[PDB]
Subunit: 260 residues, 4 copies
């Protein structure tokens, strides 16, 4: 099942969409400069692009490290991004009351992994009618995603994207099960599946190999963070990186699926 | 480090404290029936007791499934449990705004495991000054608990309990690392550590073996949800009394 | 099901048996010296004791680490240990052809974890008729142990001990599932289950807590690869294990 | 580091090599039939090829279960494969004494995953001087592989292939950590790393997606079994390999990018 996001077609058999951006919105000018670089590189390579940032990063290393600009100023900045670049945007919500104001501005609203079973939030998100990105908790299996999906459907919203971010593998370590992509496709009605490579690892050097492995399984999109300069990609390496992802994606998508 | 909760002393070298009650509050009458039963059994066995219940089911099977009595009704029921029996109570909080009102009534406020790293909730809970029970996320190592403890300390609250509830072990399964109790005691200043045997399990046949194994490591309390409770606690008390009767090697 | 090992009764409802000694046999004199210490401490506490050592260790940390005195001298040392102390002994075997001669002297023969599925060794071990200690691989679930038990039963030997050593938990880390003990008892006909506490340890400092946790689940024995427990803390350690085991074993199963 | 296996160059920046065959040797006629299919398909696809089979299944669930033709019959069958097709072959060895006899005939000898820590088998295999395939145990980390490599090096053999086959994930389940390939290359001197997709899997349907994911990380080879649950149906080999070759060719055509 495909989802239309303005003029973008998101689907497991369409050219991959980059959900790309930064961790926390904490500025106007710098946000715009980083977005500008994403837009320039993705336009150059012809890759559909959705800008990502959180306005409230609620799980930070220290309690007084900056949470971000917050909802009201964050939405102002997202409005500027859309008016300048003409692209869709994505951001996460944390409480039901945020869902309406965020959804009026942002094309995709995201359910944080740690809140993915919070029924009140799921219902409030569903009722916006907005496209939703569901972050898969590291402690949840791929077959258990249908249960979150069912809840969204019961509440009247089937415009859902499932986002892989790795699975707990012993202490303080994540593994990405490449077989989980297929399980999610087969058990949740072939909804768009995307891959958060940034939150799947702890080391920067391995991002390309891990991203290519995931995209080899035939996915709707790649979800990453960069920094203007730990796992975030150096922004200057974006073009070299995306050249490789596009190469593989273009190959994989050009062939029809082979049933075993 | 010991924590005083009314007349109860909670600490890793004190007689274990039982935390128990219901999953979700359904009514005042059934709440008082269950709590009276725990009080009766724990009293005759001589085990300190803190009544546990949540006023809200945050995760529910259907979007239309029953959701508990909610904050206002829930706090009313707790107020009366405290009146009737004169025991401390414990409940979980999910939103920062809930903390101060819930903290007025409930002696211990609990940080859900799913929300353990949510900075806003940590600060709001700390600010109440109440005793706090920190559920260890299944995806978090014992040595990383010190970072959550550090946050509560920066926010000015050191009346902290650490609560084991198992660790992710492949898909859809939990294992309890019995070595994690000692690592938490060693790295988090010997704060009270308790064991949620119920949410560590899958099936109930194994609750006794698991509870005994955990309490053999020398813990402040046990957290759970024929007279099976009685039979169970007789055995836990025997082991706890033995373990705590020996000097720490 | 209980297993008689000379004058010892080994079983999940009997006083726990200690299995311990040295890693590899080198000399009669040094073996007797270490064994004598275990015997004295265990006799002082009234704990049954089976002396353990390898005569030919096949899974050494380095290729040129000493393998042990070998089969011939190793069995002579075992004979002397049995004659001097009047206790049973246990050793590992990794070659089918070794099983018969080793079983002539050693009361319990042990199947290394890494050979646990090797049919030829299982068959040769079973055919000795001796008591066998099955070391559970860290990658094998407790419900899969019944298949190993089945292969021994097919080969005509039911005198089996199941030895827990922890399970793989991500990378370079082991966890002991305390629920696995009960699963092995229920699925494997209540064969004696013993706990190799040393294998999964991060640090020697944690041995006591981990040993006590496992023994709380009601087990036939405790197995030491003694990180290693310092032999001078052995008495104080065993005082605590016996305290717990005596308490648990004295109460009838629920 | 590359490894020459007769005319084949095996290495992490070379065209992938297929290590392909069957579970166990059952008879000569069946073995030649299957091998002939592998050879015909790989030759026309231009994929280097090494035939795989075990001569003994040492760990079956029943002591009565069928175990294969055995060592003596097995080696004879391997000789006929090498004569008929002129390709290298690979088989596993479970006991030290079998190593030199097996290595006379079999170009690559394989250390079984279960026996990784069997020090006498390591030494016996190393002494043969043959190319060695090390099956990565499900219970060993990619950074623990250096320890086995070290032993082989101490024993005087550096022609080692590292073969991923998944990692233990809870009970009775495997997960392949796609980051482990990189860790092995970086910590074990860039020895050839290959991927056993077959023993990594519980379910047949997923073999192509998993194989593609692994090969996307830039590998020396793919290791797989066919049948005429997890083994690939033999008739699908050509279509399967068309896809694997397409990806490998793409990945290998772009320079390595550091991050
Ligand atoms: Cl995110
Ligand atoms: Cl998560
Ligand atoms: Cl959790
Ligand atoms: Cl093992
Ligand atoms: Cl041993
Ligand atoms: Cl194989
Ligand atoms: Cl393995
Ligand atoms: Na919108």
């Amino acid at each position: 099942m495909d989802i239309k996001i303005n003029d973008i077609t998101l689907g497991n058999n369409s050219p991959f969409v980059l959900f790309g951006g930064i961790n926390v919105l904490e500025s106007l000018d710098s946000t715009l400069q980083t977005c500008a670089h994403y837009v320039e590189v993705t336009r150059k390579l012809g890759i559909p692009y959705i800008f990502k940032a959180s306005f409230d990063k609620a799980n930070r290393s220290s309690i007084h490290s900056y949470r971000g600009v917050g909802l009201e100023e964050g939405l102002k900045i997202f409005e500027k991004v859309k008016a300048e670049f003409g692209i869709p945007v994505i951001t996460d919500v944390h409480e039901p009351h945020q869902c309406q104001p965020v959804a009026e501005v942002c094309d995709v609203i995201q359910l944080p992994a740690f809140l993915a079973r919070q029924t009140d939030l799921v219902v409030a998100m569903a009722k916006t009618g907005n496209v939703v990105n569901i972050k898969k908790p590291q402690f949840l299996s791929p077959s258990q995603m249908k249960n979150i999906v069912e809840k969204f459907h019961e509440a009247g919203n089937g415009k859902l994207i499932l986002c892989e971010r790795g699975s707990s593998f012993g202490y303080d370590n994540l593994v990405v099960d490449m077989l989980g992509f297929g399980v999610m496709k087969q058990t949740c009605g072939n909804l768009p599946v995307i891959f958060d490579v940034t939150h799947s690892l702890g080391r920067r050097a391995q991002a390309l190999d891990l991203a290519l492995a995931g995209m080899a399984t035939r996915l709707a999109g790649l979800f990453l963070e960069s920094h203007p300069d730990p796992s975030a990609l150096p922004l200057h390496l974006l073009e070299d990186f995306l050249i490789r992802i596009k190469a593989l994606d273009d190959l994989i998508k050009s062939q029809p699926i082979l049933t075993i």
